[PDB]
Ligand binder design. Structure first.
Ligand SMILES: [Zn+2]
Ligand SMILES: [Zn+2]
Ligand SMILES: [Zn+2]
Ligand SMILES: [Zn+2]
Lengths: 48, 4, 53
C-alpha cells in the first residue's frame, strides 16, 4: 500500500514513522535516524 | 522504563 | 537533544537523549534512538517524542 517517505522520497520498509500532526506525512528509518521533521511527535508502525 |  | 527525565532505555540501559521511542502497547517500555535504529521491539507500535516538553 503506496507509502513513500517525505524526507528523501524513497521507499518505507520496516518501521514507518507517521507524523501525528501533519496529515499525510511519513519517514523511513534512515530519515528518522538523520533527524528530519524532528519538531513533531511521530507514531512508529511496524511494516508487514 | 520509568525510574520514578 | 534533551534528556527525557527518569527514562531508562530497555535496549541498552542508558539514558534516553533526543527522541524517546515509547511503546504504546506495553505499560513501561522505552528505546533511545540508537536501540530504535538497531530494530529492537519492532512488533509494537510506539510514540516517538523528540523532546520531553
Ligand atoms: Zn509533522
Ligand atoms: Zn527517507
Ligand atoms: Zn538504548
Ligand atoms: Zn511493547
Amino acid at each position: 500500500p503506496n507509502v513513500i517517505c517525505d524526507g528523501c522520497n524513497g521507499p518505507v520498509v520496516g518501521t514507518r514513522y507517521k507524523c501525528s500532526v501533519c496529515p499525510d506525512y511519513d519517514l523511513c528509518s534512515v530519515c528518522e535516524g538523520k533527524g528530519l521533521h524532528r519538531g513533531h511527535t511521530k507514531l512508529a508502525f511496524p511494516s508487514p | 522504563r520509568i525510574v520514578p
